[PDB]
Every structure is written in C-alpha cells, then in structure tokens.
Amino acid sequence: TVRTRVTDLLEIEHPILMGGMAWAGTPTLAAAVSEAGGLGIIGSGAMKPDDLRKAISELRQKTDKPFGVNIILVSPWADDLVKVCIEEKVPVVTFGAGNPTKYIRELKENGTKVIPVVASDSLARMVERAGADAVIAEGMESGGHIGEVTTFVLVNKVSRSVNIPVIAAGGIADGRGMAAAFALGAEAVQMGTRFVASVESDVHPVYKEKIVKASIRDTVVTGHPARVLRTPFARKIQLVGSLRRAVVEGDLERGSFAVGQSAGLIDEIKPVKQIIEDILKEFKETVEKLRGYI
Amino acid sequence: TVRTRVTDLLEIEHPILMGGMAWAGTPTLAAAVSEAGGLGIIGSGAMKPDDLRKAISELRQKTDKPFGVNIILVSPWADDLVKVCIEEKVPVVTFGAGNPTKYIRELKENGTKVIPVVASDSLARMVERAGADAVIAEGMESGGHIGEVTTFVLVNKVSRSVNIPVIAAGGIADGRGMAAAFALGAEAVQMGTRFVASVESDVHPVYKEKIVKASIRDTVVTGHPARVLRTPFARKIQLVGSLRRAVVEGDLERGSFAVGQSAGLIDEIKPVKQIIEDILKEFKETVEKLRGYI
Ligand code: NA
Ligand code: NA
C-alpha cells in the first residue's frame, strides 16, 4: 500500500477513485470499491433527491468506509442533491459540468470534503481559492463529456498551479498509469472505465464486452463534446436517455457508450479487489524500474 | 545523466530528441541539440534532395555527434530523400505521415537506425515486424498533424505491444513529463515545442513569443487533423505555405502555428543546454519523489 495526501485527506487506504458516472455509478459498485479500500462514488447525475437518499442508504448497508457522491451541476436537482449530501453526512462530494463554487462553503462547513472535476488550469485555481479540498484534473481521453486538454499536459500544469492535492482522471487503467500520474504531480487517480469493467459493476454485460473488445482507437468525440465508443448510434449522431440505454439496456443501436481511451488497455473483466491489487503491484514495480535510472 | 536502451541504440548521451518539423527543424537547431548530447533532427518535410544535402553538411560543420533526419512519406521527394540519407550516412532516420515499411530494409542494410512515428498500436507492431529499431509513439496533444490517441494511453499500449524501444512524443516539455513517459514504458522522449522555444531555434521571434504566452487551452484542431495555436488564420480555416509563413515570417494573419498543448507548460525561451540540464534534474527529483511512496 502507498500513502498520499489524498489517502490522508479522504481517510481511505488506497489513492484510487472510481468514476461515479450517472447510471454506472451505482451503490453496488461504489460499495465494492470503498470496501476494497478505494473511494467508491455514487453517480447522482440522473437522480432525484429521493433516489440519492436510497442510494446512500444501500451503500451504507454494505460498507462503513468512506465514499463519495458525484453531483452534476447542470442537473435541475443540483441544489437539492447538495442538501441531501449535507443531511446524510456524505464524506466526499465531487462535482462535474462547471464551477461548483456556490456550494463549496456549505459543504465544507458541514465537514464534507469537496473535490471539483476540472479540465482547465484556471478553474483549478478558482476552486482552490473558493475552498476546494482537492481537484480532479480530468483529461479529454476520458469517456463522456470532456474538456480540451489531455491528461499528460493537464495534470502537470494543474499540480504546479495549486497547493491542494490533484487527482488525475482520464486514460488511467493500470499501475503504470498510476505511477505516470504521480510523476506528473497527482497524488491519486480516478479510473472510471477500469471499474465499470469489473465483476461488481452493474452495467449491462454488453457494455462490459464492448470495453474489453475496444481498442485505444475505438472511441469518437461527438457533439458540448463527449467521448463514446464507435457504435452505430455514435455514427448517427455525427440523445435523451441514450446513456441509460447503453448502461442499463446494453442497446447497441441507440445507446451512448461513454467510455474513455483507456478501454484499449482493458482486456478482461476483473473483480474490484483484483483490480486494486494489480494496480498497487504494478505501481511499485514501475517505481522500482524508474529507480534503476537514477 | 540517465542511460536507456535509446541512448545505447542511438549512441547519444541523453534520451531526449527534438521534433524535426519542417522549417523549424533547421541544421542550426539540430546541431545545437546534438552537440548538447540529445538527438538533433533535421526536418526535411519541405526540402528537395539538394536542400537536405546542404543541411546535412552544415550540421556536420558544427557537430560530430549523432543526428537524425525526419522524412515526410507523402512528400513527392520521399524516395530521393531516403536515398540522400543513405549516401550521406545519416545515422538516424525518423518518418512521419504513414507506414514507411518500404524504406526500412534499405536504410537498415546501410547501418541507419530507423524510427517511424506512429499514432496507433497496430502500426507500431507492423513497423517492428518490418525491422524498425525503435518507434516514436506520438500522442494527439502534439502540434501539427496528429492521430487520435493521447500520449498517456498511447505510450502505455504501444510499449506493451513491442519489444523494441518506444519514444514518447506529445505533451512533454519538462523532467516530470520525462519521468511520466518512462513510467508508461517509454525509454526516451521527443519534445518538439520545447526545443522550438529555445535560444538556438531559428523560428521567428513571434513564433517563440506565442509559445511562451500560450496556455494549455490555446491550441485548436483543424482539418487530416492538425493542432495549431488559436490564431486568426486557424479561425478562418474553420493552407499551402501556411506553416512556412508562421515559422519563417512570424505571420499572425495567415501563418499556421503548429504547436502542441505543451506550450502551456513553457513560460520562457531557454538555451538548449539549460533545457536539457533542467529536464535531467527534474527527472531525477521526480523519481526520488516517487521512491518515497514505496
Ligand atoms: Na479493451
Ligand atoms: Na506558454
């Protein structure tokens, strides 16, 4: 095991977060990641406050360990979903789709750790100023809605610009990537596609099979750009409910398969426990390898 | 100094290559990088055989150390430029814009090290089979014509797929990036924009100033996609001679400023010697930092 400012901040064992996408970020997958020592994350993007309350309850029936809730800022229920996180003492809240400054203070005053997802250097500095505990720097190789900067560049610039810990997201699916992210300045990694491709993930079996089969070149950017698998529906687009149809129904015809380029690094569906074991082992072997040079 | 399979293969001191873009890859910049212990590279993309012959001669008037020539496969003079490299005993030849399999054997039979630039896992395996000595895995954050895969993903997958050394290109401008690339599996790095932004680079002063001022978000992908600075001409395009107008004339109006996202990591024009010194120092500090975790 490796210790970082992020495992200290979040009071977890491993510096590894799952994605917490809508529909795929279920309490079942989040509970598995958290119990395994990482940070499971409930994706509330498609949730109403009642749905999130239930989701939090069923996660806590499985694990006592820390967990996060991801809130999409453009959701009509965003204010109320933040209020749910405060009332249910959610330990960690991540944000997507913009600047969550308006919520940071009330979350922090009530003891929640706040970690906005950013695709820019300027936004990172802004949310640091507004009180963020850490930031996720998400490169555009990730799946779903994306920014413009790649992980290799973004993590480097963001970590140099802030003093709070940086978490790298996008393109990370193994221990090599964890070491590479740490070299760029990150102190944890978020691996959305890798944990969607797990035994404990409840995405449709077809979703898992497509990730396994997909190469590093099998995603496309369509549209507010978003990265999805090169599926028939992604061709026809070049949208409402399309992500749910892929995740829940495995619909190859009109599902949007929001997966990142790291799908080309994923060749089999693994248990969450094995994923975390293999990451840590390869991270350590990679660092020993680098040490050989100096 | 750090030793890798690439410094052994190329018989150079440091595992650091410059870009060798057309117009910017001049003998003056290449000679400076090679004499400083890296691999300077003459960019022949806009050259006729006579031009390349002269270019090689003037580089050798400055340095006795190894150097490369980059050949663009779609150039009408590609066959003849390869023949020039054979006759003038060019130690290293890189290729861009496709599959250079048809030339590998004659170059290798005459003692030249052949390093194709690839943007895919499949092409990398193909050129390995055809006899390549190493491959440059170039992520789409680089400037100029680009593939689809980012460095973070591409270097990882490519290095796992071949046994020959992999050189990482795209997004690398400092020692952190060198360590990150090595973690993903690379054994050298190519830093086009970083060496264009050098005292010994002969690109127009405006070109250098734009790189310095540019942030990580100040490039755009236009068109055969190509990454350029967010300039008025890049807006109007959304082309013939446009790269020369930027590099040679510093034309903000109709120059194509082919620079990568790593321009946002570059805040000043440095001597080539200092660039290489700072890379090596930060690479070693980064590896020591990673060692702290294990
Ligand atoms: Na795959
Ligand atoms: Na800059």
CATH number at residue A78: 3.20.20.70
Contact A137, B216 (CB under 8 A): no
Compute the CA torsion angle B98, B100, B101, B107 (nearest 10 deg).
-170
Residues B293, A2: C-beta atoms closer than 8 Å: yes
Chain B residue at shortest CA distance from A267: B157
Contact A28, A202 (CB under 8 A): yes
Phi-psi region of B11 (alpha: psi -120 to 50; beta: other; left: phi over 0): left
Is residue A22 annotated as involved in ligand binding?
A: yes
* Distances, alpha carbon A162 to alpha carbons A138, A156, A186, A282, B251, in Å: 15, 11, 11, 28, 35
Contact A150, A118 (CB under 8 A): no
Q: In the beta sheet, which residues pair with residue B286?
A: none
Ligand 2 centroid – CA B249 distance (Å): 20
* Distances, alpha carbon B197 to alpha carbons B49, B117, B277, in Å: 27, 22, 15
Residues B152, A151: C-beta atoms closer than 8 Å: yes
Q: Is B7 on the interface with A (CB under 8 A)?
A: no
Is residue A143 annotated as involved in ligand binding?
A: yes
- Determine the Cα–Cα distance for residues B186 and B16; give it in Å rounded to an integer: 11
Question: CA-based angle A286:A32:A227, to the nearest 5?
Answer: 65
- Determine the Cα–Cα distance for residues A113 and A101; give it in Å rounded to an integer: 13
Which ligand sits nearest to residue A266's alpha carbon? Answer: 1
Q: Domain range holding A10?
A: 1-294
Nearest residue to A170 via CA among A187, A203, A146: A146
Nearest CB among B4, B156, B262 relative to A176 is that of B156
Contact residues, chain A, for B183 at CB < 8 Å:
176, 179-180, 183, 286, 290
Residues B153, A264: C-beta atoms closer than 8 Å: yes
Chain B residue at shortest CA distance from A183: B180
Distance from chain centroid for Cα B146? 12
Q: Is A150 on the interface with B (CB under 8 A)?
A: yes
Residues B172, A157: C-beta atoms closer than 8 Å: no
* Distances, alpha carbon A79 to alpha carbons A73, A139, B243, B272, in Å: 8, 27, 49, 53
- Determine the Cα–Cα distance for residues A194 and A173; give it in Å rounded to an integer: 5
Start-to-end CA distance of chain B, whole Å, equals: 23
Q: How far is A58 from chain B (nearest CA, A)?
A: 34
β-bridge pairing B219-222 and B226-229: antiparallel
Contact residues, chain A, for B171 at CB < 8 Å:
150, 152-153, 156
Distance from chain centroid for Cα A225? 18
How many domains, chain B? 1
Residues A217, B148: C-beta atoms closer than 8 Å: yes
* Distances, alpha carbon B194 to alpha carbons A29, A124, B260, B269, in Å: 43, 24, 9, 9
Residue B62: which H helix or E strand, with range?
helix B49-62
Ligand 2 centroid – CA B210 distance (Å): 7
Nearest residue to B256 via CA among B198, B210, B190, B290: B210
Contact B130, B114 (CB under 8 A): no
Across B144-178, b (16+ Cβ under 10 Å) vs e yields bbbbbbbbbbbbbbbbebbebbbbbbbbbbbbbbb
* Count of Cβ atoms closer than 10 Å to residue A27 Cβ: 24
Contact A81, A112 (CB under 8 A): no
Contact residues, chain B, for A283 at CB < 8 Å:
293-294
DSSP chain A: ----HHHHHHT-SSSEE----TTTS-HHHHHHHHHTTSBEEEE-TT--HHHHHHHHHHHHHH--S-EEEEEETTSTTHHHHHHHHHHTT-SEEEEESS--HHHHHHHHHTT-EEEEEESSHHHHHHHHHTT-S-EEEE-TTSSEE--SS-HHHHHHHHHHH-SS-EEEESS--SHHHHHHHHHHT-SEEE-HHHHHSBTT--S-HHHHHHHHH--TT-EEEE---EEEES-HHHHHH--TTHHHHHHHH--TTT------GGGGG--S-B-HHHHHHHHHHHHHHHHHHHHTT-
Nearest residue to A216 via CA among B117, B147, B51: B147
Contact residues, chain B, for A153 at CB < 8 Å:
141, 171, 216, 261-262, 264-265
Phi-psi region of B9 (alpha: psi -120 to 50; beta: other; left: phi over 0): alpha
Chain B residue at shortest CA distance from A177: B184
Residues A139, B152: C-beta atoms closer than 8 Å: yes
Contact B74, B46 (CB under 8 A): no
Positive or negative, the CA dihedral A64, A65, A66, A69 is negative
Q: Is B264 on the interface with A (CB under 8 A)?
A: yes
Q: Which residue has the tokens 């405006």?
A: B206
3-state secondary structure of B117: strand
What does the block give as tokens for B155? 């270097």
Distance from chain centroid for Cα A291? 30
β-bridge pairing B166-169 and B188-190: parallel
Contact residues, chain B, for A174 at CB < 8 Å:
156
Nearest residue to B151 via CA among A257, A3, A171: A171
Q: In the beta sheet, which residues pair with residue A69?
A: A42, A93
- Determine the Cα–Cα distance for residues B187 and B191; give it in Å rounded to an integer: 14
Q: How far is B118 from chain A (nearest CA, A)?
A: 13
CA atoms within 13 A on the CB side of A35: 17
Question: CA-based angle A207:A213:A214, to the nearest 5?
Answer: 85
Residues B151, A152: C-beta atoms closer than 8 Å: yes
Contact A274, A37 (CB under 8 A): no
Q: Is B137 on the interface with A (CB under 8 A)?
A: no
- Determine the Cα–Cα distance for residues A269 and A271; give it in Å rounded to an integer: 7
